[PDB]
């Protein structure tokens, strides 16, 4: 099996990540993840904090995962790309998930809290079975 | 085994995709796909229809795949990138493939139908064994 | 197991890649890789040679790998992206590894030889066990019977 573990680490993040076990019955490859707060993306590089700590596991072992833009991220009203193409998250990383987004236009772009600009893909592109939303301040499960 | 299934939608796409079975003797990871139409990429974002329906399978079961730019897509004369970095195609997706291409230059760029700007990589990067080009008016296996 | 093999080509690449076997105790997915030469990235597309020969193997067989930008490659001061998003390296490729880097800014950007702008990831995202830095005068492995 392949499972994700997402823990909100701020107040605004808790509103979008209440404790739950989410099943991927549609069997999509990506796990959508929220902005959790309104933000304005200036032209050029923007550092976006996702306000979550994430773990991925495959066959009982902690693995890495990848951050990929959703197709909806770039539109005619927002010329947005992920600076690093895809974000490579190593299994040893236990910090907060971050995004480097380049606004390629000359116009600042308003992003809303509920929007999901990116999705998480497990190492090896394995379909996630469950997305476990952990409680804030809890210790992550052992793998 | 890992196999791709490509079905042309338009008459022009059928010209570039006649029914056949292509073998991946070189053992390449990506499956180059034609644009299947001449097109002009305006500066900024461009929505490009590939005029094909694609399914990927791994060990008898339908799987997802990924759309990746080819090295030749970007040159000194055309600054083209895929807007989403790589396209993530879920196994449940059954519609026509599409590309979001950003022309970073200030002048329109002409692309020919025979050009392969992008390649398809199976979920998990499994190397394809066969690329099945299907007839236009049939249903997927 | 999954292992990478790196052989420097130029003199300065040899200075950055002396013979050694690097173990991936952190179990990181990416293998950081040096520029091996000072370079100036002009606005627009830049074709960059990595000055190394690279192979990846998985369960005794040669496999492909992927070139991914590191998070450190793009900063507020240098707007650098990989033109193809990620570089897909087929196992047959054996030639020298190339980069297509777009400088999105209006002024040239200086990169130092010691900087690691990109990282290599094995086919299927398998975590590498060892990273073998080969001498310039030793045989590069083929991982297969000599074909045809
Ligand atoms: O888009 C990204 C890329 C990386 N990281 C974190 C997780 C990685 O383990 C660590 C190192 O990333 P790189 O330097 O290898 O890109 O930074 C992110 O939070 N977001
Ligand atoms: O480049 C792309 C990316 C996605 N899709 C289709 C297939 C996916 O299943 C669906 C959703 O993609 P995301 O929103 O997850 O990127 O859109 C494309 O046609 N082209
Ligand atoms: O960033 C890249 C991408 C590709 N290649 C080489 C290795 C591949 O086997 C070959 C074909 O690449 P594509 O045309 O499939 O992108 O070019 C590189 O050196 N660097």
Numbering used by the authors:
A (entry chain A): 2 to 144
B (entry chain C): 2 to 142
C (entry chain B): 2 to 149
What's in the article?
ASFV encodes a dUTP nucleotidohydrolase (dUTPase) (dUTP pyrophosphatase [Dut]; EC 3.6.1.23), called E165R. The enzyme degrades dUTP in the cytoplasm and thus minimizes misincorporation of uracil into viral DNA, which plays an essential role in maintaining the fidelity of genome replication. It is indispensable for reproductive infection of ASFV in swine macrophages, the natural host cell for the virus. We show that E165R is a homotrimer and can specifically hydrolyze dUTP.
However, we obtained the crystal structure of E165R-dUMP complex rather than E165R-dUTP complex at a resolution of 1.70 Å, with Rwork and Rfree values of 18.8% and 21.5%, respectively. This result further confirmed that E165R has a pyrophosphatase activity that degrades dUTP into dUMP and pyrophosphoric acid. Each of the three dUMP binds to the interface of two protomers of the E165R trimer. dUMP interacts with N85, G88, L89, I90, D91, Y94, and M99 of one E165R protomer and R71, S72, and Q120 of another protomer. Among these interactions, N85, D91, and M99 from one protomer form hydrogen bonds with the deoxyuridine part of dUMP, while S72 and Q120 from the other protomer form hydrogen bonds with the phosphate group of dUMP. All three E165R subunits in the crystal structure of E165R-dUMP complex contain 1 to 144 residues of the total 165 residues of E165R, and the 21 residues at the C terminus are invisible due to poor electronic density. The secondary structure of the E165R protein in the E165R-dUMP complex is very similar to that of apo-E165R, except that the C-terminal 310 helix in apo-E165R is missing in the E165R-dUMP complex. There are certain anticlockwise rotations of each E165R-dUMP subunit relative to their corresponding subunits in apo-E165R. In contrast, these values become 127.0 Å2 and 62.2 Å3, respectively, for the binding pockets in the E165R-dUMP complex. However, we did not found any magnesium ion, free pyrophosphoric, or phosphoric acid groups in the binding pocket of the E165R-dUMP complex, just like in other dUTPase-dUMP complexes.
